Design a protein around this ligand. Structure first.
Ligand SMILES: *[C@@H](CC(=O)OCC)[C@H](C[C@@H]1CCNC1=O)NC(=O)[C@@H](CC(=O)[C@@H](NC(=O)c1cc(C)on1)C(C)C)Cc1ccc(F)cc1
Ligand SMILES: *[C@@H](CC(=O)OCC)[C@H](C[C@@H]1CCNC1=O)NC(=O)[C@@H](CC(=O)[C@@H](NC(=O)c1cc(C)on1)C(C)C)Cc1ccc(F)cc1
Lengths: 305, 305
């Protein structure tokens, strides 16, 4: 029993992290087969942060202007292309540690693991969720760009995030591995507003099911409610609306417990309206929303990789 | 910016995880060089399970009764012995992925990363604290025994925990890698009482300092107090006493923020007396106590390994 914010094993991704340096700019890169992926910002010459001419700057920089270091092994760059906001460096050696991988674009509410890296070396791993406003609440410092986020689908490392920027609110923004930002952000020091953050309702319910599986049922009542009666309440507290698609995704946890989705919504409606009575749920005094229904099932089953 | 429950990179440990099988009983082992370490209770049956004479059970076992498998290759046990609650199986093959390692016994309040495994394969990684009552609040299912906990101290994987049992409260107990349990627990199904748990005061203060480093200052007050006055309040709220050694340990965070330790103690004193005002600190509505001062500096300064 027990339920923790659990990250994926980071070994497979650790073997892909390298240090990319261009001029004075140094950051992290992802080395898969003979291609190294990093944020294109590495070629900016400081002044370019505002209005970078990436077209003239890629033309400007030679292959020799890029240093790639896999630990203490220098990788020879033989090509440099740009895909949206990601710079792609072709190197003369294929990474033997390359795992079975895919590039995936995740949706808001889905979780992933982040391997925070600096100078091509790992510092730690933690779980994140793509917020409804396409930011992430991570832990990134200067030098952290190029760090990636990922899931492990069975035996395939699904890369879904590369880190680029930090907003003034202390949250973070980045791209998929094709260079396309999540949300309406651009890798430049310009004006950019993140929408209102909302609570990921489908995830809160999954977490309440996890609580029930692990023997926390004090929030359970005998009431029930309709899908639209619950959303009337949720929308007032910046909770994203619940749909039948979310109810279906919760079926597996509904089954394991015998508690219908709409009976748990009624219990959640109560917690949304009148707080938590100074009690806790799986060690928290707030409604946790960064656990997907899948995360709960795999945690309460022991799914290995 | 940002502060997350951050685990160490698990790569070095993933490469040491193997599957140990004695009869029908299968669990996880740690393969360092030419020896596999695992819980001795793999030799038991459920008949012996109760108050087993382990010395009599090992005697009855041979090397051939132990099947060890690293991924898809099988290792040959060429010797078996027992040190406290840990079973050492000398194997004919030495692990090439063995990191520079050390077996360490951690103090209460210290943290470590847990690599939850099943059938010799990792499932996830998360942070744990050795509670003052020598339990840990983990996430473990059947077949998780043998999973280990660790810190990375610069260039050395310091193994500090091997998982054994779940108590009726939902908490967990285990040993160091020398086979010696943390706390008064035994690897048997016999009466075992965990003491009344307490909050790790020094860690709460470190987490409040992390909040200040990350901009959350709403809880700071202009007051300071004595170490006895603070401890008078603390004892009432089930907080372990604060010692001068903990004050010194917090020096670097006080030194970095400009807030004296006893100044922060008065801020915590008022949070305990009057509550958190329905607010959150670093995304929690509770006072978090599973971040050591080092953990705070680790994540706030970008340590790598
Ligand atoms: C990553 C930069 C890096 O690793 O390169 C080292 C040479 C860095 C991440 C942030 C640093 C502080 N905490 C972070 O998460 N990104 C940057 O430095 C970019 C600039 C910023 O992100 C600033 N924030 C904004 O510009 C901003 C403002 C708004 C409204 O939205 N975004 C932070 C410094 C505060 C520039 C950069 C440099 C190199 C890259 F590879 C990508 C992006
Ligand atoms: C691990 C056993 C395993 O890996 O499978 C081998 C076939 C398992 C993990 C615990 C159960 C689930 N969560 C856990 O942490 N441990 C056990 O099965 C041990 C039995 C128990 O822990 C029981 N609890 C007690 O006996 C107990 C009683 C008191 C007063 O305090 N604790 C729970 C299952 C109810 C037995 C075991 C088996 C094999 C080992 F290598 C070590 C320990």
């Amino acid at each position: 029993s027990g339920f923790r914010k659990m990250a994926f094993p980071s070994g497979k991704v650790e073997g892909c992290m390298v240090q990319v340096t261009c001029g004075t700019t140094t950051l992290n890169g992802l080395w898969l087969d003979d291609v190294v992926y990093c944020p294109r910002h590495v070629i900016c010459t400081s002044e370019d942060m505002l209005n970078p001419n990436y077209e003239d700057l890629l033309i400007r920089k030679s292959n020799h202007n890029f240093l790639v270091q896999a630990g203490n092994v220098q990788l020879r760059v033989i090509g440099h292309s740009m895909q949206n906001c990601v710079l792609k460096l072709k190197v003369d050696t294929a990474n033997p540690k390359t795992p079975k991988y895919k590039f995936v674009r995740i949706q808001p509410g889905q979780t992933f693991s982040v391997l925070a890296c600096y100078n091509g070396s790992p510092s730690g791993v933690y779980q994140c969720a793509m917020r409804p406003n396409f930011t992430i609440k991570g832990s990134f410092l200067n030098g952290s760009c190029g760090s990636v986020g990922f899931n492990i689908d069975y035996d395939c490392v699904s890369f879904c995030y590369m880190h680029h920027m930090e907003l003034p609110t202390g949250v973070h923004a980045g791209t998929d591995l094709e260079g396309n930002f999540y949300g309406p952000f651009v890798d430049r020091q310009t004006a950019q507003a993140a929408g209102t953050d909302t609570t990921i309702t489908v995830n809160v319910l999954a977490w309440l099911y996890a609580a029930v599986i692990n023997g926390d049922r004090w929030f359970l009542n005998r009431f029930t409610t309709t899908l639209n009666d619950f959303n009337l309440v949720a929308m007032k507290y910046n909770y994203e609306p619940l749909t039948q698609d979310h109810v279906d995704i919760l079926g597996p946890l509904s089954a394991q417990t015998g508690i219908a989705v709409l009976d748990m919504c009624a219990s959640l409606k109560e917690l949304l309206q009148n707080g938590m009575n100074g009690r806790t749920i799986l060690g928290s005094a707030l409604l946790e929303d960064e656990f997907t229904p899948f995360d709960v099932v795999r945690q309460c089953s022991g799914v290995t990789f």
